[PDB]
Design an enzyme around this catalytic site. Structure first.
Site, PDB file in Angstrom:
ATOM      1  N   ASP A 279     -25.265  90.333  80.955  1.00 54.15           N
ATOM      2  CA  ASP A 279     -24.953  91.411  80.440  1.00 54.15           C
ATOM      3  C   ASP A 279     -25.668  91.061  79.115  1.00 54.15           C
ATOM      4  O   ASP A 279     -25.936  90.303  78.843  1.00 54.15           O
ATOM      5  CB  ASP A 279     -23.600  91.057  79.761  1.00 54.15           C
ATOM      6  CG  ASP A 279     -22.502  91.713  80.595  1.00 54.15           C
ATOM      7  OD1 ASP A 279     -21.464  92.634  80.354  1.00 54.15           O
ATOM      8  OD2 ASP A 279     -22.706  91.034  82.124  1.00 54.15           O
TER       9      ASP A 279
ATOM     10  N   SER B 263     -19.122  89.719  76.356  1.00 58.08           N
ATOM     11  CA  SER B 263     -20.227  90.755  76.015  1.00 58.08           C
ATOM     12  C   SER B 263     -19.558  91.014  74.357  1.00 58.08           C
ATOM     13  O   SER B 263     -18.578  91.337  73.672  1.00 58.08           O
ATOM     14  CB  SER B 263     -20.311  92.361  77.351  1.00 58.08           C
ATOM     15  OG  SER B 263     -21.097  91.237  78.008  1.00 58.08           O
TER      16      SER B 263
ATOM     17  N   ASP C  97     -16.512  93.806  74.896  1.00 56.44           N
ATOM     18  CA  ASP C  97     -17.465  94.008  74.803  1.00 56.44           C
ATOM     19  C   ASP C  97     -17.525  95.181  73.658  1.00 56.44           C
ATOM     20  O   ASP C  97     -17.974  96.735  73.528  1.00 56.44           O
ATOM     21  CB  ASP C  97     -17.244  95.541  75.752  1.00 56.44           C
ATOM     22  CG  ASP C  97     -17.384  94.477  77.358  1.00 56.44           C
ATOM     23  OD1 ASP C  97     -17.573  93.405  77.482  1.00 56.44           O
ATOM     24  OD2 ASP C  97     -17.584  94.884  78.369  1.00 56.44           O
TER      25      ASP C  97
ATOM     26  N   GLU D  58     -15.713  99.391  80.915  1.00 56.29           N
ATOM     27  CA  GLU D  58     -16.280  98.535  80.832  1.00 56.29           C
ATOM     28  C   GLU D  58     -18.233  98.973  79.482  1.00 56.29           C
ATOM     29  O   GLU D  58     -18.333 100.084  79.718  1.00 56.29           O
ATOM     30  CB  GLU D  58     -16.860  97.210  81.059  1.00 56.29           C
ATOM     31  CG  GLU D  58     -15.318  96.891  82.325  1.00 56.29           C
ATOM     32  CD  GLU D  58     -16.305  95.738  83.071  1.00 56.29           C
ATOM     33  OE1 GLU D  58     -17.065  95.990  84.147  1.00 56.29           O
ATOM     34  OE2 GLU D  58     -15.793  94.701  82.970  1.00 56.29           O
TER      35      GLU D  58
END
Ligand SMILES: [Ca+2]
Length: 448
Positions: A62, A140, A224, A319
């Site tokens: 990522d 992330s 995230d 996500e």
């Protein structure tokens, strides 16, 4: 009956939208472009230490660019900056955030240098914080270049010693330049937890623990974080799951018309099928959300806001939350695995980027291309050019956005480490999107 209808004042990724992705996805309008295997390269500078302590070629996953407030790629002292998760499969679980950098004018992947880890192992223990010392992994987030010209990072504090607890976290990354072609991470400051869930709007790990944890098949997420600004206000948009008061997981969720969409005949047919089939329990647990919190100017939590969109019944896992303003409209994206979905016609090989558009930041998000489909990738994970974590990077002008992703690159011959995928273009026009034919960029390219 038990049939009801509650939208909770928020948008929904509906079953009616999702059942129409099969066949539609076979159009080159949505297919991730085929990539050239002969020129795939490892990130040369991507070298570091494993859990055993020795120096190895890293697997890079990522990644996210340092962005201006509007989402365009930032310039920092002539450099473009990319934060990326990386590690060594001999540690397997262990992942950390690395800072990669390259003169904006350069184009080659070989031009990406490595400033190393953003954080020292010791960093999490410095501040007086409710959560940081329990951190086991770095997951992330996003990065923004402030008006004061500072490197402001947002990431996910993952805790393996607290049942997979995820906390939205921030730190200012202090930089220097030892010479005129090197960026150096001096250290961090203002390193603090922001948000770990409330229970009513977004699920907490305590709710995950109390229900029975891993054994249940429930998937708790709170990660995230993506930074944006609107009307002078600062926000993070993130992956989460709903709480008790905005359409929680559970059996009764299967009776909410708002999660189904379409007409009554569709609602009845789809619900009957879902209730009787093999996916009943999976769908009941599925309550993924793209959440939004407002921040103070010091990046502390200001207001826990209702979700932008949820995926009740469909999936627990939406996500890599992404949002930006284009042509006065708000575009909201998420990546999703078919394997985690409960939709007929969507299976284990299917990987998606889904997209939605609204007239305002917190308004009603309507599906791009009528279903929400933007990108479809279905290569076997063992294929060299398998790509994952597709992310739309807005550009300073033009109707095109640059899609970045990582390529797991599990080929037999060198180079075979996880690396930046060749970037490509997606045209955005109103509520319509299209992959731009015959336009593949260099690996990890952020801008055109
Ligand atoms: Ca759930």
């Amino acid at each position: 009956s038990k049939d009801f209808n509650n939208s909770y004042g928020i948008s929904h990724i509906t079953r009616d939208n999702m059942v129409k992705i099969p066949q539609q996805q076979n159009s080159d309008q949505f297919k991730v472009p085929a990539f050239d295997e002969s020129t795939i390269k490892n990130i040369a500078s991507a070298k570091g230490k494993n859990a055993s302590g020795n120096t190895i070629d890293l697997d890079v996953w990522d990644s996210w660019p340092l962005q201006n407030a509007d989402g365009t790629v930032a310039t920092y002292h002539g450099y473009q900056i990319v934060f990326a998760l990386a590690g060594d499969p001999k540690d397997s679980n262990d992942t950390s955030v690395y800072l990669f950098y390259k003169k904006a004018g350069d184009k080659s992947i070989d031009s990406w240098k490595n400033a190393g880890r953003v954080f020292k192992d010791s960093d999490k223990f410095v501040p007086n914080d409710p959560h940081l010392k329990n951190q086991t992994q770095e997951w992330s987030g996003s990065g923004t270049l402030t008006k004061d010209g500072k490197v402001r990072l947002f990431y996910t504090d993952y805790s393996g010693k607290q049942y997979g607890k995820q906390t939205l976290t921030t730190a200012q990354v202090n930089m220097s330049q030892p010479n005129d072609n090197t960026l150096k991470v001096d250290g961090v400051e203002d390193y603090k937890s922001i948000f770990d869930g409330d229970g009513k709007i977004y699920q907490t790990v305590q709710q995950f623990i109390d229900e029975g944890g891993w054994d249940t098949g429930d998937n708790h997420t709170l990660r995230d974080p993506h930074y944006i600004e609107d009307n002078g206000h600062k926000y993070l948009v993130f992956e989460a799951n709903t709480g008790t008061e905005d359409g929680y997981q559970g059996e009764d969720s299967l009776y909410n018309r708002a999660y189904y969409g379409g007409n009554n005949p569709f609602f009845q047919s789809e619900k009957k099928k879902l209730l009787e089939g093999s996916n009943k329990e999976k769908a009941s647990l599925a309550n993924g959300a793209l959440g939004i919190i407002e921040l103070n100017d010091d990046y502390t939590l200001k207001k826990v806001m209702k979700p932008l969109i949820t995926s009740n019944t469909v999936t627990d896992e939406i996500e890599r939350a992404n949002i930006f303003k284009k042509d006065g409209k708000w575009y909201l994206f998420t990546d999703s695995r078919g394997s985690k979905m409960t939709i007929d016609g969507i299976g284990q090989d299917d990987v998606y980027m889904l997209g939605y558009v609204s007239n305002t930041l917190t308004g009603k998000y309507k599906p791009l291309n009528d279903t929400g489909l933007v990108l479809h990738m279905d290569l076997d994970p063992n294929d060299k050019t398998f790509t994952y974590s597709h992310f739309a990077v807005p550009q300073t002008k033009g109707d095109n956005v640059v899609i970045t992703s990582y390529m797991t690159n599990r080929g037999f011959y060198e180079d075979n480490h996880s690396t930046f995928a060749p970037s490509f273009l997606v045209n955005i026009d109103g509520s319509k999107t299209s992959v731009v034919k015959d336009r593949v960029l260099e690996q990890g390219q952020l801008t055109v």
